Amino acid sequence: LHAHAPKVIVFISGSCLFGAISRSLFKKLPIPYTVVLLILGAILGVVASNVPLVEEHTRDVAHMDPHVLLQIFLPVLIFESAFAMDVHTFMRSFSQVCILALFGLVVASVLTAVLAMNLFNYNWNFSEAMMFGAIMSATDPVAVVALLKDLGASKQLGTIIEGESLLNDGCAIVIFNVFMKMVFFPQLTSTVGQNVLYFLQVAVAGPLWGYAVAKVTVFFLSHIFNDALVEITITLAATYLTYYIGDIWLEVSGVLAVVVLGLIVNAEKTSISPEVEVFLHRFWEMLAYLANTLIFMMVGVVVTQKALVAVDKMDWFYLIILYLAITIIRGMVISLFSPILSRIGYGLTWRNAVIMTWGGLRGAVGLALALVVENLAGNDVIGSKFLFHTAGIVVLTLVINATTIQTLLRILGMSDISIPKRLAMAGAVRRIHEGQNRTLNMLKSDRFLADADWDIATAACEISDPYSPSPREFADMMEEARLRMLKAEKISYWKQFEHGMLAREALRLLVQHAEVAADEKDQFILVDDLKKSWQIKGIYPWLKRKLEDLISEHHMAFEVTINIAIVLNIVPIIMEFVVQDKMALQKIEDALRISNYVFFVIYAIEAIVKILGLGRHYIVSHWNKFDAFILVVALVDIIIAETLSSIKVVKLFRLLRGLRMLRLTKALIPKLILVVNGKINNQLSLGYDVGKGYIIGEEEVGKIIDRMVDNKKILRELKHISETGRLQVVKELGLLQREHPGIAVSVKTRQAIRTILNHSRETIHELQGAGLLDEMEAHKLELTVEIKMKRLMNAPSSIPPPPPENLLKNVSWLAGDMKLIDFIKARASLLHFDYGEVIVREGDESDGLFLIVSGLVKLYGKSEVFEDYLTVGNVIGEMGVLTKKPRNATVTCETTVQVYFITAEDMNIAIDTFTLYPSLEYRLWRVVAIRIATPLIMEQMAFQGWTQEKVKLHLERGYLVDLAESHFQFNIDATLEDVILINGTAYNAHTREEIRSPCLISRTVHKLTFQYTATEEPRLFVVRNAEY
């Protein structure tokens, strides 16, 4: 309670209250709240100049040390800016931002510096003018990206402006740091070589240091389970130690390190627990908000105390001229590079350039650097002028540029809402309005709410729309069909995502392509544009093959023990020689000489044991030759040390590093192979998600448009485009399996578990929603799911492809029936086929089954109408042997192929032999039945909200009826959902109407009767309601 109390708290706490007041009072007014904070800070400053008591509270901030200002606020501002943004659209447009942020910053700064030299009468030198330019070129576009996120062009113009701001803020501090030393801390004139190393440290070592710290950080985040506090604390510690260690100890650019760390930790959001990801965004937003309020408050105080005392009348004239100049300079730079930017990324239109030119608001980062000059100036007038102009420009930009950006967007015609969005919002609002009427009518019947005031209720719950054969005939219908197709596709991608079938990156790629296609004439989604997702860069296969060659050459303990021995031996090999470089402690240092002999003996025993185990074959492996040369050198230098100028010592210093530490590469190379596998896996995993998402999208939409577009000539074209896309996608993804078998298996197993766990989570919420499972108990199981989700990210990047005999075990109708697996495995024969060979042809009798264990085969049949590709795991000929009808399609190998062949005679014997309740006949028809059934139920369900998987899960509940038990079937709405005829022909009992084999049965039909025939025996599939 004495005067020693921390008076900084009242300021920090008071700043939060003032920020809240300014943010709430001016929420609907156009002027940003940050300007109000500057005025409040000025009021506080003039007050503090007159009432001593308040001065005691501002003192600890209004005269804050620069090397606490920068070390605390800047890492927060830069990390939040890096952590908040969309990295993937940023990386897919990286070069355009780099061109306009690095080189754009240089020209903008130099031009501002020249202006500051020539116009202003302050007689500044080029170092000071470059500090001025660096401060004046730092942008804070938050107020503009916020609008662009809502109105439109969010994935194009929002990211470039935000990324440009991020990079220009990062580089401005570097320039400001460089020129601050040459102004306030001038050293002796450095050599050109010294300067070059200085450039490498700030420019190259910074990003490398940040990259290393990030890759270490994400590694540990991936191994933290059920501990959110540790994750948040690790993020904080990593971000603050990256700046401190990089800036103070390593003499490396801290800001750029944090930029890279934030970007990487954003890109690897999957390694963070989902519940902590949603917390980190709000946490860093809050820290940045605190930082901004303090900077504006401090600026408001210090300008009033010690900046405005030195402003002359002509200084205002320069401020206006400077404001005009930097705005002109920014637009000049954007236009001058515009020819270059037009060729890379999303080129800038003239209206986009104006928004960027007008949207370049200045903010805290600029002001923070101005406070450094004010403090380091030591009451030299340079400090006042720096802070005066930086505050002036910020106020002008916030009062003029920010307050008119919305009207400029309206004028330029970018604030309009597209008809599709307006219709979607209107329909959603109307549906919401209808839903409330249903609820209100239901509530009015409740006994305990009959006395409620329904006028107030109805007024309160209202939701209002926020946005409130001729050539021409054929051209218009084509456009309507095209846009309706694209809109249906976008719906499918969202349904797939909401049910966990796609990762978000695949969703955003697919949606971006759909929207881009919508905006171009006669443009559908082109698989050639999607191909970039699953193209593997050539460097990684090459590295994998080379590194496997290096490592593809007895006890378990030797390698681990010795590798530990080496990794520890770095400690002597550093601490002796580094201190010897200073001695050039001897009472202690000689102990390391003695222990060096013990390490020699360790490696010697290792070599002796290895020679004994390998015997004469020790020389066969080149890796061991180095293992012997190391011992030779160690013995040689030990003899010199024991038995006997500098050549006897410096040689030791060098050799006991060179031949000492390079033998860890044996252990390392496998880790590099794993990293390379991971890089391929991350690209191949995205490829499958995008490709498979596209195929599902096309299959779902193709069943919709049959009931949306009237003109058949339009209808044929659209379904032609969908099919020519589907085939190319399924082929490209099929080939990648042959290129990278094990990584494909890893991807496919990872998708499988990801699906199982998601559906597992739904059952918990169903049980929790039904009250069978308490809230806490459900939470305890839901954690077990989420930990298992996080362990998938750490699963091996390659699973060795199972041998052919394993695939038979995992076939659907062979699963779990050992006596049948043994029967088939014995009689199943493996066949090899070369490229272009036909396995079977149309019209051939059904000789047997083919189980593709490797390769890719092309199906082509007249049933050119039919065309498809099948790959590992799929089985060909099931319909054939069951019905004994001829082949459906010709099968051609697109790659060297292996197939397990089971003769139709073996199948018939197996069908006769294995006749328990889950009969092999029942199983083979069930697997066939669902494939035939799924298209029909999906065609019926086309208008409704299910995905294809919910249609399958709906079908999996079904069963085949034993029409031998009763040769007629009757339907009941209360206990039966739908019925599908799979093979045969069926008669409605009341009319004997012809229903042919593939038909789905209409719900009006009551009773079905069949003809007792053997040649086309009736097979029928049925699904009961969940209540049986």
Numbering used by the authors: 70 to 537, 570 to 654, 676 to 706, 725 to 784, 794 to 1012, 1030 to 1194
Quote the passages of the study that discuss this structure, keeping the authors' original sentences.
Therefore, focused heterogeneity analysis at the protomer level with a mask excluding the TD was performed instead. For the apo dataset, four conformations with a resolution range of 3.2–3.4 Å and with substantially improved densities of all the domains could be distinguished. The most pronounced differences are confined to the region of the CHs. They are accompanied by subtle conformational transitions in the VSD and CNBD, which further indicates that the CHs might play a central role in coupling voltage sensing and cAMP modulation to exchange activity in the TD. In line with this assumption, the extended cytoplasmic region of S4 forms several interaction areas with CHs, which have to rearrange upon voltage activation.
One example is the sperm-specific SLC9C1 that belongs to the SLC9 superfamily of cation/proton antiporters, known as Na+/H+ exchangers (NHEs), which are essential for the regulation of intracellular pH, sodium homeostasis and cell volume. The transport domain (TD) is accompanied by a voltage-sensing domain (VSD) and a cyclic-nucleotide binding domain (CNBD), which are regulatory units usually found in voltage-gated cyclic-nucleotide-modulated ion channels, also referred to as CNBD ion channels. In a recent patch-clamp fluorimetry study, the functional integrity of the domains was confirmed for SLC9C1 from the sea urchin Strongylocentrotus purpuratus, termed SpSLC9C1, identifying it as a Na+/H+ exchanger that is activated strictly by hyperpolarization and modulated by cyclic nucleotides (cNMPs). Specifically, SpSLC9C1 adapted to mediate cellular alkalization in sperm only in response to chemoattractant-induced hyperpolarization.
